[PDB]
Design a protein around this ligand. Structure first.
Ligand SMILES: *[C@@H]1O[C@H](CO)[C@@H](O[C@@H]2O[C@H](CO)[C@@H](O[C@@H]3O[C@H](CO[C@H]4O[C@H](CO)[C@@H](O)[C@H](O)[C@@H]4O)[C@@H](O)[C@H](O[C@H]4O[C@H](CO)[C@@H](O)[C@H](O)[C@@H]4O)[C@@H]3O)[C@H](O)[C@H]2NC(C)=O)[C@H](O)[C@H]1NC(C)=O
Ligand SMILES: *[C@@H]1O[C@H](CO)[C@@H](O[C@@H]2O[C@H](CO)[C@@H](O[C@@H]3O[C@H](CO)[C@@H](O)[C@H](O[C@H]4O[C@H](CO)[C@@H](O)[C@H](O)[C@@H]4O)[C@@H]3O)[C@H](O)[C@H]2NC(C)=O)[C@H](O)[C@H]1NC(C)=O
Ligand SMILES: *[C@@H]1O[C@H](CO)[C@@H](O[C@@H]2O[C@H](CO)[C@@H](O[C@@H]3O[C@H](CO)[C@@H](O)[C@H](O[C@H]4O[C@H](CO)[C@@H](O)[C@H](O)[C@@H]4O)[C@@H]3O)[C@H](O)[C@H]2NC(C)=O)[C@H](O)[C@H]1NC(C)=O
Ligand SMILES: *[C@@H]1O[C@H](CO)[C@@H](O[C@@H]2O[C@H](CO)[C@@H](O[C@@H]3O[C@H](CO)[C@@H](O)[C@H](O)[C@@H]3O)[C@H](O)[C@H]2NC(C)=O)[C@H](O)[C@H]1NC(C)=O
Ligand SMILES: *[C@@H]1O[C@H](CO)[C@@H](O[C@@H]2O[C@H](CO)[C@@H](O)[C@H](O)[C@H]2NC(C)=O)[C@H](O)[C@H]1NC(C)=O
Ligand SMILES: *[C@@H]1O[C@H](CO)[C@@H](O[C@@H]2O[C@H](CO)[C@@H](O)[C@H](O)[C@H]2NC(C)=O)[C@H](O)[C@H]1NC(C)=O
Ligand SMILES: *[C@@H]1O[C@H](CO)[C@@H](O[C@@H]2O[C@H](CO)[C@@H](O)[C@H](O)[C@H]2NC(C)=O)[C@H](O)[C@H]1NC(C)=O
Ligand SMILES: *[C@@H]1O[C@H](CO)[C@@H](O[C@@H]2O[C@H](CO)[C@@H](O)[C@H](O)[C@H]2NC(C)=O)[C@H](O)[C@H]1NC(C)=O
Ligand SMILES: *[C@@H]1O[C@H](CO)[C@@H](O[C@@H]2O[C@H](CO)[C@@H](O)[C@H](O)[C@H]2NC(C)=O)[C@H](O)[C@H]1NC(C)=O
Ligand SMILES: *[C@@H]1O[C@H](CO)[C@@H](O[C@@H]2O[C@H](CO)[C@@H](O)[C@H](O)[C@H]2NC(C)=O)[C@H](O)[C@H]1NC(C)=O
Ligand SMILES: *[C@@H]1O[C@H](CO)[C@@H](O[C@@H]2O[C@H](CO)[C@@H](O)[C@H](O)[C@H]2NC(C)=O)[C@H](O)[C@H]1NC(C)=O
Ligand SMILES: *[C@@H]1O[C@H](CO)[C@@H](O[C@@H]2O[C@H](CO)[C@@H](O)[C@H](O)[C@H]2NC(C)=O)[C@H](O)[C@H]1NC(C)=O
Ligand SMILES: *[C@@H]1O[C@H](CO)[C@@H](O)[C@H](O)[C@H]1NC(C)=O
Ligand SMILES: *[C@@H]1O[C@H](CO)[C@@H](O)[C@H](O)[C@H]1NC(C)=O
Ligand SMILES: *[C@@H]1O[C@H](CO)[C@@H](O)[C@H](O)[C@H]1NC(C)=O
Ligand SMILES: *[C@@H]1O[C@H](CO)[C@@H](O)[C@H](O)[C@H]1NC(C)=O
Ligand SMILES: *[C@@H]1O[C@H](CO)[C@@H](O)[C@H](O)[C@H]1NC(C)=O
Ligand SMILES: *[C@@H]1O[C@H](CO)[C@@H](O)[C@H](O)[C@H]1NC(C)=O
Lengths: 128, 113, 102, 453, 132, 132, 53
């Protein structure tokens, strides 16, 4: 199986810097890009940004630059290389950032692009 | 030998709408030389001698209208009807004619519900 | 930016019927993606590449259309198939097409 | 006579698209060198430079560099061939040891930091009884402090024994010709305005590819293939922001790069037939490695690439260039190998631009690493030995690998970051022309003749 | 249809010429079809793939009438349901790259008829020798 | 002796049928005779053994009268000391598996006579062309 | 009370890698060109002598 398992929900203060991890397991984590996408009530889906975890090459949404920061932690052992941990530090928390955050991955088909997101994390509810 | 297994045992539906049926084979019947595949889909009425419906695993027989479609290659095969008639509701059969012994399917008895 | 607009929005249909959901792209020439989100659950890829079905989805979700007109056609509405539907083009989204039970 | 009779013809010129394994080849002067002073000199067949090609009239094939094969083959073969030049080399198993590191002898400034640590350690001698005390010089990026006393270790002491790059073998690029076997052909697109997607109207068959010097550079691909008359930007799909844009421009940008520090290679005897080449003295000044581009020609080429980028984004679009958003070391700062020495040079002076729709030289600083983790393997690092003297090299900036940011919420501008990412974007900028096809004889056609019995 | 000309006339040179003109240069593609510590395995399997493909094509020829003719005629007639077009609009209009697509669906229907006619002609020849 | 029947008629299908009936399916065994970190060496030597055996058999044919006929007749007569049995009791009675054992001892006496008759026919043909 | 391993005087003992598993997966032994494989479908066949099917 392919699992994207996040941390639990959190309540933060206005002005904090929240950090949400995402453990990916069941596949070569160095291959597939990890996207971060959010859901706001009465605003819909908004895309936050992707990371290529082979070198951590990040790219952000334009209206979220200066606030988001994505890192990763690979698996360095010849025995269990099939896992990894993505991170997202979203900083400058406002009460307009109360939303449910998602780490997602594309499908592994030959016509699946970057954005056709098959696999989906359970989401972290963040109330500021 | 080669086991021909039909996946449902019966199918009692209403008339007018489409259905679909499947026959799995224990051995891949796709002839690699001819690149064509070996199913005979038959139709037996109650108390009657059967007749062919689908030959070469895809092609309909003359005298059979356009509402049938033999489909699929490899090992698993599908007879898809497009419109059910009152003349059609009796037993279907799948047959491999790739080797001796010639074995048939179990026989899915389609009737009217 | 690609402005996506979903035309039916709130549509109430009885079970066993068929539903047609329209998505309208401000810029054409690209594919369209269809997601389903049920109430209090995780969204699921239904359709990618405007016609292709995902892994583990039944056949009655039929994507069609091109240019600026993109159709998601559901046939024989199951009780589970009354949810919110989203159309994605590359990083942009629609505002949701809720399918309610009459 | 209206009844035609069928005839099968052998030797019919017609091809299908196919996926096969091309084989390597080198030039005769590249075949002249021996003893594996470079990689695999006798493994590949010798051939001519600029191999023979003939032109095909009235033919049109659709190409696609993005779904192309044989960039996968070249990527796999260069990784495996990089690995196969390390099995005779020396593993640094006895060097994972406690390093007592002090600062280099230098006028220390408390605001800045010394980028060299003078580290002494116990080394095993050639006799298994006696050990010695020996010192060396390492960089900050290669050692980490383990937890008064100040003892360090290497960063790769908990992942791998680090194979020393053998100082006999060199890492200079020599051009590979990818030759097709019998039954297959290779088609090259001679079209000028061809973006690597769709129908090419002017192809030519060729037995081997033209020379591809294997350069390893994340941003700013060096010594590449120049475009014909104008800058050409190439992407799989422009509106997708997770696709890189490969920019190939006409006249190359001359870049100079140097380490001005005069080093002393010192040999340390590990065991029987085991030698570790460490840094000895820094003879002279402690200066920082850097690079220069020309200010005027870089502004010229940025004007050219903005002129070409406004064709896909409308005329009234403000194009601005900012530096990389983050990542590891060799995805944010542009890496290369200047003769057995791995530089990591800061590009913040280059991509600092904005462009409205109406004698100097940029110095840019570099870091140097001695141990590397090329292609991000699980357990294979590589020590690289120091080399003597001041090291300078001249190269041609041929293109760029850009990436557009995720522009939403009424983007009046569109900004472009540099980014290395995968190495295959470096390899797709050279095999964008070619494809490989399978030649299939035995056509079949009707004509008006029955076989006489 | 061959004349005096000094240019090389090489491999796949007439791929875009009409198929009545690429037929006058078929020995070139027939000629340039066969001859051309770990990598010897890759080179070696490429070479045996080349000779295996050449043997498969020569075997497909050999079980038909022509074994080394390189232009051969046979006794099955052109079914006009296959291509339904005139004789004048193939040898002077189209190429082999374009004629390959137009009968790729009707390929492997033709080859069985070729083997059938050759086996029937072999048994007719054997019976004609046998009655004498 | 071929009729209408829809069964596959595959490789070694008529091995137990009489040799007057397995002769009507000989292109099947002729077709299915060629195409089919260390193990590539084993696969590769198996493939070159296959093509070497095919070339040896085609060379034994080629130095005789038939090079691609797959049924050929020649000018050496059947010595009745070899099998001493009737013509009616081979093509309707026995199989190739059973006829192989009955002339395996007289094999390689026959092949030299085949090469001898083919060399004599080649030199007779050369002299007949030469006198014209 | 000091012990040792039993194989300390014969070999350095290679650890089975925990990445690779030892589960059985079915092998099909395929013949090359020119060779065939015959299977006996006979019921009462003791693996010796003539198989009729
Ligand atoms: C982009 O393309 C350019 C053009 O080729 C490359 O520039 C060359 O880079 C190579 C390797 O980096 C250089 O080779 C080295 O040059 C050093 C300078 O010596 C030169 O000058 C003397 C006297 O004229 C010559 O005898 C000598 O051959 C050189 O031309 C040498 O010190 C080096 O030699 C040492 O190492 C080799 C390794 O095997 C030994 O054989 C030698 O005996 C000696 O120990 C080496 O020859 C080359 O000079 C550069 N050419 C130019 C014109 O600058 C760029 O490197 C390339 N960019 C990238 C990123 O690869
Ligand atoms: C970004 O740009 C690239 C470059 O154009 C684009 O790639 C193309 O995607 C399409 C699919 O979206 C690929 O498939 C082709 O689609 C065309 C038009 O539909 C047809 O010729 C073929 O599709 C037919 O068959 C499909 C299945 O059989 C049907 O579902 C379909 O309706 C058609 O009947 C063909 O498969 C095409 O090959 C690529 N081309 C290249 C050069 O990559 C990509 O899709 C763009 N991104 C997005 C998100 O749209
Ligand atoms: C790639 O190169 C760029 C520039 O070539 C480099 O950017 C510089 O980084 C440093 C720190 O990494 C930035 O910060 C400076 O650090 C000193 C340290 O004491 C501060 O004192 C500086 O503050 C001065 O300037 C302020 C504004 O003018 C004053 O208010 C203050 O009183 C001080 O006078 C300063 O913050 C430095 O600013 C940038 N340069 C620029 C132009 O922004 C970059 O770090 C390199 N990349 C990497 C990965 O290192
Ligand atoms: C792209 O350019 C920007 C602008 O120069 C760079 O941002 C700068 O990054 C440096 C770090 O490299 C920041 O320096 C700071 O130094 C203090 C010293 O104690 C340290 O405590 C901080 O944690 C930080 O490292 C600097 O403030 C920052 N400047 C701005 C305006 O953001 C950026 O690093 C460049 N990117 C690349 C890949 O080079
Ligand atoms: C690095 O440190 C070593 C000590 O471990 C220095 O070597 C000593 O330098 C002093 C000063 O000249 C001499 O008196 C000693 O005899 C040296 N000892 C040895 C063993 O060489 C060395 O100079 C330092 N080098 C740098 C560049 O800082
Ligand atoms: C030797 O290196 C150490 C670091 O391991 C230096 O200690 C700190 O260095 C930084 C920058 O070089 C300064 O900002 C700190 O103030 C230093 N710490 C202290 C307590 O002073 C140290 O300065 C270096 N030089 C010497 C002579 O020890
Ligand atoms: C090299 O080896 C020597 C001897 O094994 C180490 O010196 C010892 O250091 C410890 C810790 O300071 C002392 O308690 C011992 O008394 C020392 N022994 C001797 C003989 O001097 C030394 O630390 C090692 N490393 C270096 C860099 O010299
Ligand atoms: C590369 O050039 C090709 C043309 O050779 C472009 O492909 C066509 O683009 C138009 C829209 O501008 C479409 O209507 C056509 O269907 C496309 N044809 C094919 C075969 O794809 C392509 O857009 C160009 N790509 C870039 C990145 O500039
Ligand atoms: C780097 O340092 C070495 C010293 O080891 C310099 O080599 C010396 O150069 C002078 C004249 O240039 C000669 O008289 C010496 O005999 C040389 N000594 C050795 C050991 O080679 C070298 O010139 C320096 N390099 C640079 C670029 O300054
Ligand atoms: C990069 O280095 C080259 C040398 O390799 C420089 O070219 C020299 O430029 C000077 C003038 O500054 C001329 O007098 C020389 O004749 C040039 N030599 C060669 C070989 O071209 C070049 O100017 C340097 N560029 C930068 C931006 O530093
Ligand atoms: C960078 O590109 C320039 C061309 O713009 C190269 O200069 C040419 O080099 C060839 C042989 O290498 C000479 O025959 C030409 O006369 C040169 N032309 C010019 C205008 O200089 C140069 O070699 C390339 N490489 C480097 C390292 O500068
Ligand atoms: C296996 O079955 C075979 C028969 O197919 C047996 O073989 C024969 O055994 C009889 C005695 O019972 C002998 O007279 C024959 O000569 C045997 N024939 C052959 C071909 O061997 C055999 O004994 C059986 N074996 C076992 C272990 O039951
Ligand atoms: C190795 O040590 C470094 C420094 O403490 C640490 O960052 C890294 O995660 C360690 N790696 C492993 C595999 O333990
Ligand atoms: C931009 O202006 C140029 C004039 O040089 C013209 O050729 C081009 O078509 C214009 N593009 C748009 C999108 O208006
Ligand atoms: C950007 O450009 C300005 C002016 O050209 C310069 O002062 C500044 O240092 C540059 N930024 C960086 C990060 O180098
Ligand atoms: C072969 O089949 C394809 C797909 O059904 C069809 O489009 C094509 O026209 C057929 N070929 C010919 C020559 O009719
Ligand atoms: C061949 O030799 C064997 C052994 O001498 C003999 O039994 C057999 O009968 C011979 N073959 C024929 C056809 O006579
Ligand atoms: C190793 O030691 C065991 C225990 O004493 C002993 O039984 C065995 O024979 C020894 N093997 C060898 C090769 O000495």
């Amino acid at each position: 199986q392919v699992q994207l398992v996040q941390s639990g929900a959190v309540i933060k203060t206005p002005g904090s810097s929240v950090k949400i991890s995402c453990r990916a397991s069941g596949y070569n984590f160095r291959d597939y890009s990890i996207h971060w996408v959010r859901l706001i009530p009465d605003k819909g889906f908004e895309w936050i940004g992707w990371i290529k975890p082979l070198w951590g090459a990040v790219s952000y949404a334009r209206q979220l630059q200066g606030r988001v920061s994505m890192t990763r932690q690979l698996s360095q052992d010849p025995d269990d290389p099939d896992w990894g941990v993505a991170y997202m530090e979203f900083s400058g928390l406002t009460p307009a950032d109360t939303a449910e955050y998602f780490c997602v991955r594309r499908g592994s088909c030959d016509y699946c692009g970057d954005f056709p997101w098959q696999y989906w994390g359970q989401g972290t509810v963040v109330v500021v | 030998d080669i086991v021909m297994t039909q996946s449902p045992d019966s199918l009692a539906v209403s008339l007018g709408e489409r259905v679909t049926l499947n026959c799995k084979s224990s051995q891949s019947l796709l002839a690699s030389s001819n690149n064509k595949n070996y199913l005979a889909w038959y139709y037996q009425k109650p108390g009657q001698a059967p007749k062919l419906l689908i030959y070469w695993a895809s092609t309909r027989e003359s005298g059979v209208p356009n509402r049938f479609s033999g489909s699929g290659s490899g090992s698993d095969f599908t007879l898809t009807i497009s419109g059910l008639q009152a003349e059609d509701v009796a037993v279907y059969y799948c047959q491999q004619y790739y080797t001796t012994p010639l074995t048939f399917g179990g026989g899915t008895k389609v009737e009217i519900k | 930016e690609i402005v996506l607009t979903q035309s039916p929005g709130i549509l109430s249909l009885s079970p066993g019927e068929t539903a047609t959901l329209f998505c309208k792209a401000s810029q054409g020439g690209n594919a369209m993606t269809w997601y389903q989100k049920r109430r209090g659950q995780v969204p699921r890829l239904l359709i990618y590449d405007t016609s292709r079905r995902a892994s583990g989805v039944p056949d009655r979700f039929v994507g069609s259309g091109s240019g600026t007109d993109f159709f998601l056609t559901i046939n024989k509405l199951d009780r589970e198939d009354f949810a919110v539907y989203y159309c994605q083009q590359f990083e942009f989204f629609g505002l949701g097409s809720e399918l309610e039970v009459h | 006579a209206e009844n035609l009779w069928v005839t099968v013809y052998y030797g019919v010129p017609v091809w299908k698209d196919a996926e096969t394994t091309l084989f390597c080849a080198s030039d005769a002067k590249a075949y002249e060198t021996e003893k594996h002073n470079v990689w695999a000199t006798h493994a590949c067949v010798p051939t001519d430079p600029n191999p023979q090609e003939i032109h095909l009239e009235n033919v049109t094939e659709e190409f696609n560099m993005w779904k192309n094969n044989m960039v996968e083959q070249m990527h796999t073969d260069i990784i495996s061939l990089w690995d196969q030049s390390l099995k005779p080399c020396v593993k640094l198993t006895p060097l994972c040891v406690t390093l007592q590191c002090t600062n280099v002898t230098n006028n220390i400034t408390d605001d800045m930091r010394g980028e060299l640590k003078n580290c002494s350690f116990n080394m095993t001698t050639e006799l298994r009884d006696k050990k010695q005390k020996v010192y060396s010089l390492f960089y900050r990026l290669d050692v980490v402090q383990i937890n008064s006393n100040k003892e360090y270790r290497l960063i790769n002491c908990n992942t791998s024994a680090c194979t020393q790059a053998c100082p006999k073998v060199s890492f200079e690029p020599i051009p590979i010709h990818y030759c097709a076997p019998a039954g297959f052909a290779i088609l090259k697109c001679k079209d000028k305005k061809f973006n690597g997607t769709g129908p090419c109207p002017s192809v030519s068959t060729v037995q081997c590819t033209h020379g591809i010097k294997p350069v390893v550079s994340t941003q700013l691909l060096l010594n590449g293939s120049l475009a014909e008359e104008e800058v050409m930007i190439r992407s799989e799909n422009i509106t997708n922001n997770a696709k890189n844009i490969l920019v190939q421009f006409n006249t190359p940008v001359q870049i100079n790069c140097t380490r001005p520090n005069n080093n002393t290679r010192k040999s340390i005897r590990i065991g029987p037939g085991q030698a570790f080449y460490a840094t000895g003295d820094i003879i002279g000044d402690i200066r920082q490695a850097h690079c220069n581009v020309s200010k005027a020609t870089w502004n010229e080429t940025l004007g050219k690439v903005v002129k070409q980028l406004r064709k896909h984004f409308g005329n009234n679009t403000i194009i601005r260039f900012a530096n990389s958003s983050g990542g590891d070391l060799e995805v944010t700062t542009h890496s290369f190998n200047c003769g057995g020495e791995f530089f990591y040079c800061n590009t913040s002076g280059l991509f600092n631009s904005t462009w409205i729709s109406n004698n100097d030289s940029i110095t840019l600083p570099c870091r140097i690493k001695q141990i590397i983790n090329m292609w991000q393997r699980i357990g294979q690092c590589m020590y690289a030995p120091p080399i003597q003297g001041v090291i300078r090299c001249v190269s041609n900036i041929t293109g760029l690998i850009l990436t557009r940011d995720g522009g939403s919420t009424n983007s009046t501008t569109e900004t472009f970051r540099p980014g290395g990412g995968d190495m295959r974007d470096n390899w797709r900028s050279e095999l964008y022309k070619y494809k490989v096809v399978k030649i299939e004889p035995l056509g079949v056609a009707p004509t008006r003749c029955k076989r006489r019995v | 249809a061959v004349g005096i000309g000094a240019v090389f006339l090489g491999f796949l040179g007439a791929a875009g010429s009409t198929m009545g003109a690429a037929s006058m240069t078929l020995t070139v593609q027939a000629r340039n079809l066969l001859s051309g510590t770990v990598w010897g395995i890759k080179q070696l399997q490429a070479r045996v793939l080349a000779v295996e493909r050449y043997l498969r094509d020569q075997q497909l020829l050999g079980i038909w009438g022509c074994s080394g003719k390189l232009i051969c005629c046979t006794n099955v007639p052109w079914n006009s349901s296959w291509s339904n077009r005139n004789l004048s609009e193939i040898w002077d209009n189209m190429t082999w790259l374009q004629w390959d697509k137009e009968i790729s669906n009707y390929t492997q229907i033709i080859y069985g008829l070729l083997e059938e006619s050759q086996n029937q002609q072999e048994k007719n020849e054997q019976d004609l020798l046998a009655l004498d």
